[PDB]
Structure 1
Amino acid sequence: GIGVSTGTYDNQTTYKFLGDGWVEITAHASRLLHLGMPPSENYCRVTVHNNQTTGHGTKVKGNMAYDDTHQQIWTPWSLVDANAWGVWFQPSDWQFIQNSMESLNLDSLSQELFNVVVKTVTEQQGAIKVYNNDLTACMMVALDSNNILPYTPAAQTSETLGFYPWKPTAPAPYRYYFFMPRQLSVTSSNSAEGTQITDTIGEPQALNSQFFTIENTLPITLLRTGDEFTTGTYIFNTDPLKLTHTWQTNRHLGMPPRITDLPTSDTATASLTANGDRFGSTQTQNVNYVTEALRTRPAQIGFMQPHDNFEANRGGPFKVPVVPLDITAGEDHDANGAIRFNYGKQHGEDWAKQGAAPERYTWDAIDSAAGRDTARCFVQSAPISIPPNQNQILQREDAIAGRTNMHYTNVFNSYGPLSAFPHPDPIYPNGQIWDKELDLEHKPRLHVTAPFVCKNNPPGQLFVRLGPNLTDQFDPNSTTVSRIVTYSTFYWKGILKFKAKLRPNLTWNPVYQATTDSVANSYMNVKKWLPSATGNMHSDPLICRPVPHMTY
């Protein structure tokens, strides 16, 4: 099958309406991939320990947050990961879906590898390189259907496939965490100089050691140029994702109080009846009156989260994740889990930009009703008295354990049986799409890194690597390795299907839509999604869930 293609390139997004507002979005994605031989032929147990006593080391006082120490199993295999919005839709698609649909769900996933080509490189004189075809050479493929091997979402480290169809990409090298004891003590710059920082890493433990190899756990297919490989279709079992945001906060839940009379002019206000004589209910029985702020609501929309909370286990210190909610007027970023990420040119960064530094963006939850304005928050002693003297009210300013900047809001946890909140927004195009659930008896109500969590087993990971291309001289009992310089290219097609539903339209007023404009320096300027004079592209994160929706 040498001179015949084994597949079809297709990167078009097709919409099929079944009627009644239901839509079958079928996203085809194809890319040309490049795979080079592994630097090492075997599996390595690598360790990373940044315990320098200067700069961003862990030995310098107060540098816990900079910790990067861990151990990993480095494998000669590579992973083909397309789990990221940017791989399947072009900007316009995302816009169209966000502006017209109100619901979206995963349906099925399929992939195939085809048109494999393997080449060898040899030298010449002047020295120039020459490229030849190794027709008989092959490429190894493996598919972990049952997810035996460690799950490693490439989207988390901007290592998925490129978001540009006409540009080539490459698979990310496979590696996974290995257990290793890790202890690091807490210190501050103010902390005494004589104080010694404990920075330790231990030996591999029997109770937690897990070394897996692709060779020993999965069946492997060999692909020569005339071969091709298919995964067959996988069926998703996940919950629908709302494509709208909520705005009603506790202050907007239920029957608004009855105004006494209609405003007298277009600029006037209206007044309610006296607090003392108004009907209603409160949960503070020390005061005989009702007020929008004291009034009993059905439940609590949103909640206070501990920030910037760091916890520690055998592995080391780590920042506890927080539910991405609205950052409010006050713009309390860390308190409401805003997410900031850095990515490469393959995933959005302007191709024109130069320097090692990646592009960075901070994602602020679309929803406006579940965030928390730490500044304006406060707790009043009871029996409650209004107004309260400084000794019967704890607020932002007040300091905990005599620390100027540590306020109660930093360690306050408001989560409770009455807490209700929306689901994290999907992030085009850098966002991860689906995720494997944690194998623990008691699971989390959601994940921060992805909108769709597989209730059952998630689609299996696709692994590839070049077959060792040996030379004429080879000795097994020698650690020395000689291999012919080889590399390969091949195409990848994937088919992701969604089930989506068109939105209803009942408000009298026009609704907020995701648009583009011509105003210079505007975030939504058309010029950002067009090519430059030399073809440089730029794909910034797009808004989503533009349309508002009743919460109650």
Structure 2
Amino acid sequence: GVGVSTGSYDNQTHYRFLGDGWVEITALATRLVHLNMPKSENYCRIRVHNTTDTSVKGNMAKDDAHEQIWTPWSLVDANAWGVWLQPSDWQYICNTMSQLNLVSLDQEIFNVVLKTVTEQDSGGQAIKIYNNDLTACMMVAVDSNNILPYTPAANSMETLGFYPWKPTIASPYRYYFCVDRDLSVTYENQEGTIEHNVMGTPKGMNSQFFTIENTQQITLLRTGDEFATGTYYFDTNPVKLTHTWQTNRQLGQPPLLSTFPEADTDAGTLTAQGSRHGATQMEVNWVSEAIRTRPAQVGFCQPHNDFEASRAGPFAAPKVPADVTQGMDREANGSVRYSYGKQHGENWAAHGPAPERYTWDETNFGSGRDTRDGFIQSAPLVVPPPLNGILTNANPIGTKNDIHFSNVFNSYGPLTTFSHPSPVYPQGQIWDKELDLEHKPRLHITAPFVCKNNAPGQMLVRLGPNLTDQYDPNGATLSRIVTYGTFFWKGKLTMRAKLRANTTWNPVYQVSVEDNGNSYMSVTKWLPTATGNMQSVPLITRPVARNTY
């Protein structure tokens, strides 16, 4: 009944072209996964308190307090661009398309391999013998109804290999439980004590304990078996593949010229601000690009390092990414910093556990904010403001030298319109579930695609308990034959895009590579070494200029 493959390797990508320039991209992912016995035979409600760090006065923003539930099951997440497309392709799509959208996903497991190891040769030295058990089995299940909490692997760089010819493994399934942690505020050395840094116990009203076994239909897989998913259909909104620029200052009718340049050097002039036509919502009897009326507000002011806290403890508030601006205000316009590692980039020949990191600066210009120049004038507008007639990014709030209006000012509002972030090539997350909150969020910074209806059930896997001749239930803690396994996973991801139209004149930014240089875009980066090592560097999504008005 065995000795015959149950599936087929294929990690291709097809571009099906249709009329009106629509395109049906098809992602093919095949991967070899390894898996060994889950140490805990059961479910463990474990706790984590880093008093070693929480105790310091300034430290809190380093708080790791929580209590997870460790399941003996392992997750199989493929929700990460890096797993489906090939570097070059992402280039192609981005350099050529105008929009992209998720269509359907199809998963498949096969060619199960189960083996047990017997450490023998005690009569000579210390060897290890490998051989497979046929009767042994693996276990699969899919939380299609999504009873279990969502656990995105990119939420930890623990998704699957971005390199096909190299194997990979699964992240173990773990989920949060209810506690109610609490921590007090302190700075550098201050005085007194940390008044109380408590954790807490399980609350009757919010205790939620699930079990793969009481929630899903588990399927047994021996060597000759094989498993396959249904075919999930994505109900999502497409993502544009173009950055913008125009800011409140460049929206529509540029002022009228009265003076025309003489040579390619000197510039031109407008009409007397006093004696100029237009409209404004300030009382002054003149006009200036600065005070002129615009359609709405592009981008907005966000509060810096707004660590807020609830029964859970403290945490930094998330925030809509945006251009960093000349002001190089990163933490100010939510750029993101990733810390991937060798199955997801890294070089490969990089030494030490030190993970490689990358900060992503959003490309939706005209939406960014430069803290420095941001200022609030007063009342009745005055040509040149007094002193106590304008608060700037110098004046301190609540008696702190470096804390300014910026770090607490929130520009958001009705006329505040912006742009949806972009996806990051390798390392980036693809789709995500929606919060079951009667009132939803205009988007997640976590990922590009958010499912409007139900979402892809998570795929769980676990090896089966291979017992010994000895067994007592009431028995303290007991033996089980060593065992581990492998299997291939095959995924199908279909997308839809359309070709961009060329209308400018002046060519336009394209993602390209460069000769052996010190350039960010240097072929060599996406090339093997003499021993065969390579890295995957994030790439620009939305190389081409859009238009917003």
TM-score (norm: length of structure 2): 0.99
Q: What pairs with 1:42-191 in structure 2 (closer than 5 Å)?
A: 42-52=42-52, 57-125=53-121, 126-191=125-190
Contact 2:184 2:194 in 1 (8 A): no
Which residue number corresponds to residue 340 of structure 2?
Answer: 343
Shift of 1:411: 0.4
Contact 2:57 2:194 in 1 (8 A): no
Shift of 1:519: 4.9
Q: What pairs with 1:66-465 in structure 2 (closer than 5 Å)?
A: 66-125=62-121, 126-192=125-191, 194-285=192-283, 287-465=284-462
Deviations 1:84-111 (A, max 9, x none): 0000011000000000000100000000
Contact 2:516 2:524 in 1 (8 A): no
Secondary structure of the structure 1 residue equivalent to 2:213? helix
Identity, % of aligned pairs?
68
Secondary structure of the structure 2 residue equivalent to 1:229? strand
Deviations 1:30-51 (A, max 9, x none): 1000011001100000000011
2: CA distance between counterparts of 1:249 and 1:173? 46
1:5 and 2:10 are equivalent in the alignment: no
Deviations 1:235-257 (A, max 9, x none): 00000100001100000101000
Which residue number corresponds to residue 35 of structure 1?
Answer: 35
2: CA distance between counterparts of 1:190 and 1:374? 29
Contact 1:248 1:550 in 2 (8 A): yes
1:522 to 495, 519, 523: 519
Letter in 1 for 2:37: M
1: CA distance between counterparts of 2:390 and 2:485? 68
Letter in 2 for 1:424: P
Shift of 1:196: 3.5
Shift of 1:232: 1.6
Deviations 1:250-288 (A, max 9, x none): 001010001113211110110000000110111101x10
Shift of 1:330: 0.7
Deviations 1:486-509 (A, max 9, x none): 000000000000010100100000
Contact 2:186 2:194 in 1 (8 A): no
2: CA distance between counterparts of 1:156 and 1:513? 30
RMSD: 0.7
Which residue number corresponds to residue 18 of structure 1?
Answer: 18
1:488 and 2:455 are equivalent in the alignment: no
Deviations 1:321-354 (A, max 9, x none): 0100000011100010000010110001111001
Contact 1:187 1:197 in 2 (8 A): no
Secondary structure of the structure 2 residue equivalent to 1:215? helix
1: CA distance between counterparts of 2:399 and 2:337? 31
Secondary structure of the structure 2 residue equivalent to 1:119? strand
Contact 1:46 1:71 in 2 (8 A): yes
Contact 2:185 2:194 in 1 (8 A): no
2: CA distance between counterparts of 1:451 and 1:346? 22
2: CA distance between counterparts of 1:35 and 1:13? 27
Regions of 4+ moved over 4 Å: none
1: CA distance between counterparts of 2:344 and 2:136? 32
Shift of 1:300: 0.2
Letter in 2 for 1:124: Q
Which residue number corresponds to residue 541 of structure 1?
Answer: 538
Secondary structure of the structure 2 residue equivalent to 1:92? helix
Letter in 2 for 1:180: V
2: CA distance between counterparts of 1:196 and 1:311? 18
Q: Which moved more, 1:112-121 or 1:258-267?
A: 258-267
2: CA distance between counterparts of 1:41 and 1:350? 36
Contact 1:326 1:369 in 2 (8 A): yes
Shift of 1:190: 4.1
Shift of 1:124: 2.1
Deviations 1:292-342 (A, max 9, x none): 000000100000001110011101000000100000011100010000010
Contact 1:59 1:197 in 2 (8 A): no
1: CA distance between counterparts of 2:198 and 2:118? 47
1:497 to 494, 498, 517: 494
2: CA distance between counterparts of 1:97 and 1:546? 11
1: CA distance between counterparts of 2:286 and 2:196? 57
Shift of 1:369: 1.4
Secondary structure of the structure 2 residue equivalent to 1:288? coil
Secondary structure of the structure 2 residue equivalent to 1:281? strand
Shift of 1:181: 1.3
2: CA distance between counterparts of 1:334 and 1:143? 39
Contact 1:61 1:197 in 2 (8 A): no
Letter in 1 for 2:94: Q
Letter in 1 for 2:46: V
Letter in 2 for 1:338: S
Letter in 1 for 2:70: W
Letter in 2 for 1:258: L
Letter in 1 for 2:99: S
1: CA distance between counterparts of 2:18 and 2:194? 68
2: CA distance between counterparts of 1:533 and 1:325? 40
Shift of 1:19: 1.4
Letter in 2 for 1:227: D
TM-score (norm: length of structure 1): 0.98
Give the total of aligned pairs. 546
Shift of 1:419: 0.8
Deviations 1:463-496 (A, max 9, x none): 0000000101000111312110000000000000
Q: Which moved more, 1:81-90 or 1:519-528?
A: 519-528
Q: What pairs with 1:466-481 in structure 2 (closer than 5 Å)?
A: 466-481=463-478
Structure 2: stretches of 5+ with no match in the other structure: none
Contact 1:303 1:370 in 2 (8 A): yes
1: CA distance between counterparts of 2:71 and 2:142? 15
Contact 1:468 1:483 in 2 (8 A): yes
Contact 1:281 1:296 in 2 (8 A): yes
